[PDB]
Amino acid sequence: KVFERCELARTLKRLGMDGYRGISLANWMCLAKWESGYNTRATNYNAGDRSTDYGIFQINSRYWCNDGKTPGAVNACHLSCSALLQDNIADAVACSKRVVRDPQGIRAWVAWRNRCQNRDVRQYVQGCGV
């Protein structure tokens, strides 16, 4: 599923993402936007370390989900990476929450640092009723 901007903002808010661990909905929107263009079936294989990024938040298999083919990987979200490719984003959100409970917080995603950190991200939620 490719979410439309406001549809996604409301979906994330309903799932309890607004201000989760001090992270605003606009930041999560900026992250999803830059990671996958709001696409839940997006995947990126990293030939360098044999890991793959999954879903709307492009969560990596080395530490967050199990795909059975990433060397010495762990599954901190205790999910099959398949769960991160569903149209329903419940599991991807549960896992993103797990990611940010770690010290790095939203900084875990390099794309967030590049295109969201210290930037005006208001535009992502404007007019969405969130």
Q: Where are the domains of the chain?
A: 1-130
Q: Which residue among 4, 7, 18, 35 is the active-site one?
A: 35
Helix ranges (H only) for 15-89 are: 25-36
Task: Classify 1 as helix, strand or coil.
Answer: coil
The CATH classification number of 1-130 equals: 1.10.530.10
The Cα–Cα gap between 27 and 117 comes to 8
Is residue 35 part of the annotated active site? The answer reads: yes
Tokens linked to 32: 């999803």
Q: Which residue among 53, 67, 102, 120 is the active-site one?
A: 53
Is residue 4 part of the annotated active site? The answer reads: no
Give the method used.
X-ray
The resolution, in Å, is 1.8
C-beta separation of 56 from 3 below 8 A: yes
Tokens linked to 67: 């795909």
The Cα–Cα gap between 129 and 56 comes to 21
Instruction: Compute the half-sphere exposure of residue 112: CA atoms within 13 Å on the CB side of its CA.
Output: 19
